[PDB]
Design a binder for this molecule. Structure first.
Ligand code: SAH
Ligand code: SAH
Ligand code: 56D
Ligand code: 56D
Ligand code: HF2
Ligand code: HF2
Ligand code: CA
Ligand code: CA
Ligand code: CA
Ligand code: CA
Ligand code: FE
Ligand code: FE
Lengths: 339, 335
């Protein structure tokens, strides 16, 4: 019962006010997550704003602002000095990493819409995002949205692996969680990013897997041109989550898939997981993330393959898709079990 | 408090999408799209992208964000104004302010709230962007009350001073209305001064209107060549809250009094902090203005606070105008 074309002035005032306050609420979701407040509310159901502000050493006027923003749209409810969870808390909290990703992570790009859209401006470094904030968001995105299907695919391997290479390894939590499932297994993360190596080795060292899991720097689209080559022969499980769309355009994907095939010829299973572009979803029925993901990629000039485009690329890439998993529900996201 | 799981999905999806809508409104305003939709009721994105030399897929995204909350509707490459177009287009400059102007502040909420961080230049805003939005906010929301106040001055100014002069447009319009008038702008920012000097010169007012770099809070320290004595009309719009806290405001009001001994009327327009509006009934702007200033550590007075400060500050409020409707905003006529 949504799509009217004609409304009262009163309705339009309220609607436009809501969009405005949604913006502040949106940013506040990610911030309340990162400052601990969404967790207190999840656990205790309620909190005392002054008490919260003191405990965490926060400027209280601004802390009232954050909660009022959440409350302007029903995520929480304010009662005197108390904030309780509101009718929309669970959903918002479930998707809190997506909001963080939108604001804290990608705000700078969406803010500069008017500078970024002009063609004369689109070369070299023409936008900025917060790498550390994205990383922070993508850690929970990976867990909350991709783990079930990732683990489901690991359960369906039909063999117990021995050496697992992970493309776009970032934090290293993927490899680490593998280590624990398959006691003896060794691992080899790969990034095109320097602070991913360090953050990982530190986190690896921090959990007792230093002796096994090592890392490397290299663009995974040209993995043959990476000095770790020699060890790629012993690897019997490849993985690649939240970065496959970078392999594109199509022809560069084909190439990259082919080159990966040769560089890892002992790989039995290759688990590939990513979000895809949607098609034909109606403007007023777009779910969370979809618009953010697609629109931001369109602004960065980065290509986003639809799900069909992935499907029709694997053969030529030198791979066969033997199982496919739908993600709940990070737009249209998928896990492919390739071999 | 009780809703279905599907209502909840939809509402959270709307909040997410609104974020991108909010940002798009300011972009669309800036890039010509809203003006083009006011006139023709429609627009073609291919046509549009081309005319403006913009990356069309990003242009489609922009319009899909606005379509996603009913500001416009899409019919293939044909955008038609939506059910909320008039209201959104009306407040476009407020959305601009929120996102393009003040986006970096609200983005860094996690870094900006911890007291430890609250020293130095702990936040950032886009001066160019903000300035760009305040031009329209000034004209769209304050002008009616502003010109009503000028009509009922009870005299005709000979020399006007404008505090936080910005673009210089207020002084230009004053000169258009009163052709013999001398004009004087104080702004604390070299960039405003330079821009205003430009515009004033370009338009042919270089003789009448001139500018000095200054902090209106300590107006008593601004050299100005003795010209403050000749001023008989004082204007100050959209910066008065920076006089606060209260003891500072009383002081700044006494110093304005003294620096401008021949001012007959002092016209002061600002938005104020509201009280007791229920969370789910906040109108546009109110939350962003208040929340942002709390984040920046800047005091925002209520209207009653303003009313209660004038006497101790050396002035008598003789006329008050309500503004429609930029949160609770007002123009005071002081003497
Ligand atoms: N072409 C490329 N080659 C190697 N690494 C890349 C890359 N493009 C992006 N990356 C890296 O991939 C990571 C994206 S986030 C990775 C999430 C991780 N797979 C997880 O689910 O926990 C970042 O660390 C980024 O630096
Ligand atoms: N202490 C201070 N003294 C003088 N100007 C100040 C100030 N603090 C901020 N400003 C200026 O006040 C302006 C806010 S924008 C308002 C512009 C103008 N009053 C108008 O009606 O359109 C900016 O130009 C800023 O540089
Ligand atoms: C990492 C992020 C992404 O592509 C981006 O931030 O550009 C992403 C990828 C896939 C699913 C969710 C988020
Ligand atoms: C200039 C702006 C403001 O306070 C700010 O940008 O910080 C403002 C003041 C008063 C009414 C509307 C906007
Ligand atoms: O082509 C597809 O639809 C998927 O890429 C993989 C798949 C194919 C056939 C049977 C199962 C999975
Ligand atoms: O105190 C007030 O109410 C206003 O600040 C000024 C005013 C007072 C009386 C008559 C008109 C205006
Ligand atoms: Ca298919
Ligand atoms: Ca000074
Ligand atoms: Ca002087
Ligand atoms: Ca009063
Ligand atoms: Fe991406
Ligand atoms: Fe201000």
């Amino acid at each position: 019962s949504h799509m009217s074309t004609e409304v009262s002035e009163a309705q339009a005032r309220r609607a436009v006010a809501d969009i405005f306050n949604s913006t502040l609420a949106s940013s506040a979701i990610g911030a309340a997550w990162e400052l601990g407040a969404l967790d207190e509310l999840r656990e205790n159901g309620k909190l005392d704003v002054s008490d919260f502000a003191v405990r965490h050493d926060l400027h209280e006027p601004a802390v009232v602002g954050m909660f009022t923003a959440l409350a302007s749209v029903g995520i929480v409810r304010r009662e005197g000095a108390t904030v309780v969870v509101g009718p929309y808390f669970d959903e918002a909290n479930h998707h809190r990493s997506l909001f963080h990703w939108l604001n804290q992570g990608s705000g700078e790009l969406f803010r500069r819409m008017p500078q970024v859209l002009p063609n004369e401006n689109r070369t070299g470094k023409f936008y900025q995002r917060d790498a550390g904030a994205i990383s922070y968001a993508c850690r929970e995105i990976s867990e909350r949205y991709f783990d079930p299907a990732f683990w489901a695919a690991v359960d369906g391997l039909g063999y117990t692996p021995t050496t697992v290479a992970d493309l776009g390894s970032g934090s290293g939590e993927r490899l680490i969680q593998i280590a624990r499932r398959f006691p003896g297994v060794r691992g080899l993360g790969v990034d095109i990013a320097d602070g991913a190596i360090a953050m990982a080795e530190k986190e690896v060292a921090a959990k007792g897997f230093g002796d096994q899991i090592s890392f490397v720097r290299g663009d995974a689209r040209t993995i043959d041109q990476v000095s770790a080559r020699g060890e790629f022969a012993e690897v019997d499980l490849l993985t690649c989550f939240m970065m496959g769309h970078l392999f594109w355009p199509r022809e560069n994907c084909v190439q990259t898939l082919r080159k990966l095939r040769a560089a890892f010829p002992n790989v039995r299973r290759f688990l590939l997981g990513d979000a895809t572009r949607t098609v034909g979803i109606p403007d007023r029925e777009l779910p969370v993330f979809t618009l953010g993901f697609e629109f931001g990629h369109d602004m960065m000039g980065v290509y986003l393959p639809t799900l069909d485009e992935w499907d029709g690329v694997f053969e030529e890439g030198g791979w066969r898709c033997v199982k496919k998993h739908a993600i709940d529900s990070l737009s249209v996201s998928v896990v492919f079990e390739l071999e």
